[PDB]
Design a protein around this ligand. Sequence first.
Ligand SMILES: Nc1nc2c(ncn2[C@@H]2O[C@H](COP(=O)(O)OP(=O)(O)CP(=O)(O)O)[C@@H](O)[C@H]2O)c(=O)[nH]1
Ligand SMILES: Nc1nc2c(ncn2[C@@H]2O[C@H](COP(=O)(O)OP(=O)(O)CP(=O)(O)O)[C@@H](O)[C@H]2O)c(=O)[nH]1
Ligand SMILES: [Cl-]
Ligand SMILES: [Cl-]
Ligand SMILES: [Cl-]
Ligand SMILES: [Cl-]
Ligand SMILES: [Cl-]
Ligand SMILES: [Cl-]
Ligand SMILES: [Mg+2]
Ligand SMILES: [Mg+2]
Ligand SMILES: [Mg+2]
Ligand SMILES: [Mg+2]
Lengths: 210, 210
Amino acid sequence: MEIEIKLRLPSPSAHQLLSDALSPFHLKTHLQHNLFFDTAAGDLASVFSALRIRFYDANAKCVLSLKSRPKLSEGVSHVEEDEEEIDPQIGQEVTANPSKMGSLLEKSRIWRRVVDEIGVADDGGEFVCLGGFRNVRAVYRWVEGLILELDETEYGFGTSYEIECETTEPERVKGLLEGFLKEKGIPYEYSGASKFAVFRSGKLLPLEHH
Amino acid sequence: MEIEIKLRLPSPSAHQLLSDALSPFHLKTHLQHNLFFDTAAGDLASVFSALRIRFYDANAKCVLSLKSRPKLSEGVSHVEEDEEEIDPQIGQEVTANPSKMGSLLEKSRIWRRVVDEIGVADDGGEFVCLGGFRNVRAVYRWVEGLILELDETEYGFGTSYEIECETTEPERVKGLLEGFLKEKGIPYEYSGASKFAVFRSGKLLPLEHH
Ligand SMILES: Nc1nc2c(ncn2[C@@H]2O[C@H](COP(=O)(O)OP(=O)(O)CP(=O)(O)O)[C@@H](O)[C@H]2O)c(=O)[nH]1
Ligand SMILES: Nc1nc2c(ncn2[C@@H]2O[C@H](COP(=O)(O)OP(=O)(O)CP(=O)(O)O)[C@@H](O)[C@H]2O)c(=O)[nH]1
Ligand SMILES: [Cl-]
Ligand SMILES: [Cl-]
Ligand SMILES: [Cl-]
Ligand SMILES: [Cl-]
Ligand SMILES: [Cl-]
Ligand SMILES: [Cl-]
Ligand SMILES: [Mg+2]
Ligand SMILES: [Mg+2]
Ligand SMILES: [Mg+2]
Ligand SMILES: [Mg+2]
């Protein structure tokens, strides 16, 4: 079970000022392109699952992931996930011919899980690409070694900004994180939906901050 | 403050069997070359500080770090660190001419901290390379999203194996980790020294397991 705190920033200016506030803690910044896949009939969507191939920078690194049955409440996320780095060349071949996905990913634990739990045809001739989106992620090592991820997410239809923190102590870290945003004067709200959900919805959540 | 659990495995066979036990959780495996730097007079060593430039795989990624005043007790590590990814080309230029380190790293927060807290000459004409060592690191996402790092560390003089876990709950996670190694039959002891300390010592800690 993967547990994260997820807060949304309202605006470029809030993202700018938080970015400046965290700059003493900066570890790295990288570009991600996230692509998603499913059967033509949407079998994974029907069981609340998301299959993502993520490319870092200029095809430098590639990560395959299956994420299943997410829950989100009061800024706290829980989700079942299984992910693994793969050869970016294979990730690109999958993107080019997703009907070959089962043969291309035949040795993957992740592809094996897609088959064993959703019953899709083992060869993957059914799979299609859903499209995707771009994201700039700046990573910070904060108090107690906590890792903060500040995202600038460019969908086809708009831009959103979030800050997130993976932790085993969601209630106490979320208090820490909220307390820091208040003291630095950074408006925020709890994220109401994942980036995948926002992508599929085709529009930005209404930004209900007040 | 960075907190990690650090356990040492005695043997190749223990490393093999733990590697197999964690394979359902495997996220990535990468090759690291760690190089270290100090003044000729050892000013950083005198204040209990370690300056490392780490290269990943074939000069693919580079990380600069300053680590200061480490503590280690009962398998639990605390250390003050500040690190940041840098252009591998610059990391290599520093390696080639460490007497140019201050001009090469002039914009780094980390180099700035070396100067501001140890008073070294700002231009770095005093710095020399201490050498380094190689490490293969396999990364796992385990229960509650905890990240386990299983290391195979090749010093000039011998090989050591460790497993480590960064956490905000050291006492409870260490119980979890010890409990899993027992149930899988993996001998282990608490790590008695960091890889940097072992490197500088020039020999392997006596492996006092019994
Ligand atoms: N130590 C460590 N942690 C990692 C690594 N990769 C990912 N993580 C952890 O998992 C998260 C980022 O990877 P991921 O599982 O894809 O989460 P995500 O889908 O990007 C978060 P969101 O859905 O909101 O965009 C982070 O919360 C991070 O703490 C890693 O290489 N090392
Ligand atoms: N989410 C996340 N965590 C990271 C990332 N990089 C490092 N970490 C965390 O910091 C540790 C690895 O980097 P580092 O600070 O150099 O520790 P180290 O010096 O390699 C540990 P040792 O000294 O025993 O070899 C891990 O414990 C990890 O959880 C990252 O990119 N993302
Ligand atoms: Cl603002
Ligand atoms: Cl990143
Ligand atoms: Cl996503
Ligand atoms: Cl053994
Ligand atoms: Cl690694
Ligand atoms: Cl080290
Ligand atoms: Mg996750
Ligand atoms: Mg994931
Ligand atoms: Mg550390
Ligand atoms: Mg460090």
